Design a protein around this ligand. Structure first.
Ligand SMILES: NC(=[NH2+])NCCC[C@H]1O[C@@H](n2cnc3c(N)ncnc32)[C@H](O)[C@@H]1O
Ligand SMILES: NC(=[NH2+])NCCC[C@H]1O[C@@H](n2cnc3c(N)ncnc32)[C@H](O)[C@@H]1O
Ligand SMILES: NC(=[NH2+])NCCC[C@H]1O[C@@H](n2cnc3c(N)ncnc32)[C@H](O)[C@@H]1O
Ligand SMILES: NC(=[NH2+])NCCC[C@H]1O[C@@H](n2cnc3c(N)ncnc32)[C@H](O)[C@@H]1O
Lengths: 343, 342, 344, 344
């Protein structure tokens, strides 16, 4: 299938074991920003659900399907590939909705749905939006969508901004300098210091931060889920040109995302920006290998190229340069193995 | 091979990729109790290494092989299945020990060695001793051991004792009662409340605690690595009979372990007991879904049964009863995925 | 055929009036100096409402209120009491040389026969949460003896309710019920009754005080005008509410207190049991939800508190609360007759 | 119409069985480890008295004693319970897969009908001072279903009486009553009720525990053999005493506790509430003399404790004692139904 062709088996096994846990479903469900905003977007756009056919992609415990039912949906198809499908079907029974919600265990790329739907709902966003590559399953599901159908979320925006954080940059070398000693219990470890440095810099840093470290208005890359094909997410080239608002050393790029539910009554926004209350997505920061000095008014231009891999994640190639000086830096990171720094 | 037969490929991929990271090596090495104790065991028993042939199973970055070299070993075969083996070779060259330390990439169950060895060294202990099933690889390597060869460590003791800790119990209880809500955003979740309790209490709790929470002296279960066969670790039955020293609620069993290096000069112990300085092993507690009440003088009887699984871990079954009252508790735990609370 | 006996089970009335026959209970009430001092102040500072007047004292007990009315110059005070405390009242009236002014009349106010209509009724009819003991209905029944120009002391009653957060109290009651969760109590599986245990424990309103910082929104107020209300009004009391949440957190239930006003000709005197006021023997009352409701600052928590009077001289309380933004709903039933006294 | 109804006022019975309809009261009794542990040990360690036998459990409550009988291998257990707790007991019989061996029979043991005679009766009927609640009479009444060989668990009951000295406890009665001895409480002279307040406090048996060093003489014992006694024997209980004073001092009253023995074929097991044993939910009971009695070590304190059963499921207590060497005499009349719980 499409899913298996693009996914290494070992990665998929571990992936669906993770989401088979009720504690991980709970982790997502008790994030009020995530769960409250979905519910508010569905109910406030009730005319998009009333007496409609709905598809829920990766329903998990089924919480989003229940919101669709609260909005008057005629029939809801909830697809779930992990063993959580058993629990979702339990809740469908206990909430007396067996005539409205039909749980379908299996992968949305492999299961067989009977009819076309009026709207697809799903919560597939991961770290910097694209991690886990579930947006491709979300877009793949549009084979079941009527031509005049809708998508919730309708659009996703990933935001990129430069940041200064001397502490974070220096932290990488303080850790790596563990290896820079000539007699650790009699052993000279210093030959691995370089490898240890490179290891740390390949890890995106997941945590939050104060917005005062941002040095320029963010640049935005939009994916319209109603127009996009899943092939558009195999290679995502995000050019950026930052108009520096502050002078200082730029240590890397910070990432966050927004999604929007463009309904017939209104549009509702779910944001994970650092100017908003913290969510379980946090934010993501990728360091440059060497910082770049930029004056307020200078332009920092470059590209962020996200290349999908068979581990359900991305390799992140960043290239940046200060146009007015030519000073240039770069980095190559592995989003599948981030460093969780939040405390 | 023996390894692949007992290991799901998905688990082994994740396992050896975890141990390919230099940051994890730094973490183990910075456990000063662990590193310092291993060095002392080896150097103070230098006669067991002087001009000997050594095998280091799962050498990682190679630190134990360097200790063997410092103690006078003639040749050290350092086996390592992860990509950390290439980093081990770098250090061997940078420390000018190419004539004494020979890294052998691959699994100890698959590689070939040119000769038998006088002593096997390794650090195979996971959480609760048995996690990761590395002890089976350690014992498997005895096929390379000369008759009357030595093992470092030589024996391992598992200790288990009943504990009381209302705070910990209610902490896990609270996490599961999320699925008790009859109107989470209008949705009745209460039908999954049983499943959630089961899931949350299958997690062993990895952290330290004060010794005063323990309600009886520990029971010891000993594995003699010189005699044990790897088959002995597929199903481990630990009977226990505790004589309660205090009255109160028993919220479960606490686990720790000691290993001894029984060398020709002196015996050196590495302990993870709560009476001893903290290590990266901490201690492990398996909670009961419902505690048992006991009084001082009562006997708490039962069995702890560890069934090894193909995910390089163990399924744990604990059955316990207060003999005087017939109050029984039966619990199942998945050691693979513990809850780190420290 | 008496109004009282028609709404009261015999077994409840017997225990009720035996309880109030004890002098130790009278001492406890009298030693609430907020209560006793505020009553005296409301009467004496409005002495013109009593001077040369005819007074009816409903449920006089040992008779303290009738003595306050005599100090304010009442011409005649009929002191009605249905317990055996009426005999101790008589002793005090003689020993205080007031036999010419205070006439004890033993019996239920719904069953006795007063010699004449009165200018003012005084009573202390407030129980826990105001309504417990259904004494307000005897107080209002007594208006059949009140002149058209007559007054009532107290004149009005305000019930206040507000949502609160108190994880320790919730877990305290939750733990008690968890005993019936044991699958092997001396080898016996009790878990099948765990549901019934939780229902029983959370049926108990909690009587004690608390810090005002646990309250999550401004109180809603329900007012009873004793001068205008009729007995039948108190059979079914419906209190809708809509709270604008001022803090975020888990709503564990609703807290209740009450105020009464003595609206006299000279001044209005208030007796309050609010948690912002000095503590009285009424304390405050909290009704716990079996499952707390999560709310955000700015959300609305709406619903109904409904009190259905029962024949055990108390009320069946049903509370339905709902977070409007999320539709998270909580329904609860409580038995006000048998609260949990948590203050000790 | 029934033995129970002819000796119990309806109002008292209504309140009595409502009390035992609460799971919290069952929990309180079940969590007394001395009570529950000792019954289980007495039943299991005499398993031959139960193995494949027919058993009657009088007032089973939640049914715990019946489950212990089943653990001991009983063939058939009839568990009789008059309160609504009988519905909960049935739930537990089902959930524990014992419906084939335990039959819950809702009703009063004096009014139900059993299908057959039984080999042994089990029950926990002891109240405060052993006799409070008068359920020993229901226990004895049940012997109409017992076989000639049948046994009783408990088999015998001993109530113990001993004189004590406790200045603090005695004085405390006047400290509390002297609230009324003031001439102007908010203008009112309360002093005329001080004597009535004193009398009220002394009528209450004091329920709490104490140091054994307050006892002034070895206890006297009154025994009820449950295999032999009849209901009527407990309507008037006369306990003579002649204490030989071990210490000199003022005797302020009599302390009461009790023991019971399960006399089985294998062994006898004792359940004791004596002040020398671990504390139980029965505590101990002390009845004051309204005037203490001075006695020297070696003197004799002689008198009688008369317990007269009443229709409120309790006893009126009449104690009279005198020091034979001096003639100084004292007495008291106490109401066992309304004890004063002093324990903290
Ligand atoms: N926002 C995220 N970071 N992750 C959203 C995961 C939500 C649910 O989608 C399920 N899921 C993921 N991929 C698929 C798929 N191809 N088909 C069906 N269910 C899936 C997964 O098992 C989980 O229960
Ligand atoms: N103290 C522990 N918690 N675990 C000790 C074993 C872990 C180390 O041994 C390596 N290792 C694990 N299994 C094997 C094996 N079968 N063969 C070779 N190396 C192995 C693994 O890659 C890592 O370097
Ligand atoms: N403040 C309270 N917490 N409860 C209300 C006052 C209680 C007093 O009124 C008496 N009382 C209660 N009901 C009645 C009645 N129907 N008629 C006369 N006295 C009564 C009762 O005997 C006691 O002396
Ligand atoms: N140890 C005590 N201090 N009291 C014993 C009461 C135990 C149980 O006996 C029940 N019970 C009491 N009297 C009776 C009776 N006549 N018939 C049946 N059950 C009864 C009562 O409802 C309660 O559940």
């Amino acid at each position: 299938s499409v899913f298996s062709e693009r996914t290494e088996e070992s990665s998929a096994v571990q992936y669906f074991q993770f989401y088979g846990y009720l504690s991980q479903q709970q982790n997502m469900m008790q994030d009020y920003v995530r769960t409250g905003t979905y519910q508010r977007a569905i109910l406030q756009n009730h005319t998009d659900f009333k007496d409609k056919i709905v598809l829920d992609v990766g329903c998990g415990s089924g919480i989003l399907s229940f919101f669709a039912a609260q909005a008057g949906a005629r029939k809801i198809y909830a697809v779930e590939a992990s063993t959580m499908a058993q629990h979702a079907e339990v809740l469908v029974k206990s909430n007396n909705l067996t005539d409205r919600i039909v749980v379908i265990p299996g992968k949305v790329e492999e299961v067989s749905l009977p009819e076309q739907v009026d709207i697809i709902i799903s919560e597939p966003m991961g770290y910097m939006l694209f991690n886990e590559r579930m947006l491709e399953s979300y877009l793949h599901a549009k084979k079941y969508l009527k031509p005049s159908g809708n998508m919730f979320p309708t659009i996703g925006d990933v935001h990129l901004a430069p940041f200064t954080d001397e502490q974070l940059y220096m932290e990488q070398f303080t850790k790596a300098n563990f290896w820079y000693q000539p007699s650790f219990h009699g052993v000279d470890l210093s030959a691995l210091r370089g490898a240890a440095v490179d290891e740390y810099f390949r890890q995106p840093v997941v945590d939050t931060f104060d917005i005062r470290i941002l040095m320029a208005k963010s640049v935005k890359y939009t994916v319209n889920f109603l127009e996009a094909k899943e092939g558009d997410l195999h290679r995502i080239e995000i050019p950026f040109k930052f108009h520096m608002l502050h002078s200082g050393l730029v240590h890397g790029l910070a990432f966050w995302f927004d999604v929007a539910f463009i309904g017939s009554i209104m549009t509702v926004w779910l944001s994970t920006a650092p100017t908003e209350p913290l969510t379980h997505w946090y934010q993501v920061r990728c360091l440059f290998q060497s910082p770049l000095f930029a004056k307020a008014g200078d332009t920092l231009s470059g590209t962020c190229l996200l290349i999908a891999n068979k581990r359900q994640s991305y390799d992140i190639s960043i290239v940046a340069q200060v146009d007015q000086t030519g000073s240039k830096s770069s980095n190559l990171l592995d989003l599948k193995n981030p460093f969780f720094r939040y405390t």
